């Protein structure tokens, strides 16, 4: 019996109850980024950069 | 019996009840970034940079 990195539970979401009673919702983007309404999200990156709800307006690396 | 990094529970979300009764919601982005409404999010990055609700207006690395 070793259990090397075993029996784990990593990047987990459970038992999520959500109610969203919105009468009006409105997003207006003019250039750039808009991230809206991320719910119950699970990730596990290995040897990499992992974002979830990142937003960047605009990367301008001219020349 | 070793249990090296085992029996763990890392980056976990559970038992989340949410109610959002909003009559009006409005996002207006003009250039740049807007991140709105991240709920019950779990991540586990290894050997990497992990953001969740990052927002950057604009990266301008000219030349």
């Amino acid at each position: 019996v070793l259990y090397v990195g075993s029996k784990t539970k990593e990047g987990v979401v459970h038992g999520v109850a959500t109610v969203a009673e919105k009468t009006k919702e409105q997003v207006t983007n003019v250039g750039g980024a808009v991230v809206t309404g991320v719910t119950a999200v699970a990730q596990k990156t290995v040897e990499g950069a992992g974002s979830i709800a990142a937003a960047t307006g605009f990367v301008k690396k001219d020349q | 019996v070793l249990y090296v990094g085992s029996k763990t529970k890392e980056g976990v979300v559970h038992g989340v009840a949410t109610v959002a009764e909003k009559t009006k919601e409005q996002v207006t982005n003009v250039g740049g970034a807007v991140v709105t409404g991240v709920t019950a999010v779990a991540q586990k990055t290894v050997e990497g940079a992990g953001s969740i609700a990052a927002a950057t207006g604009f990266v301008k690395k000219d030349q």
Binding site: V30, G31, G32, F58, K60 | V30, G31, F58
Partner: peptide
Amino acid sequence: GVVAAAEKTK
């Protein structure tokens, strides 16, 4: 020459 004008004249 980034431009992101926007108007909401009601």
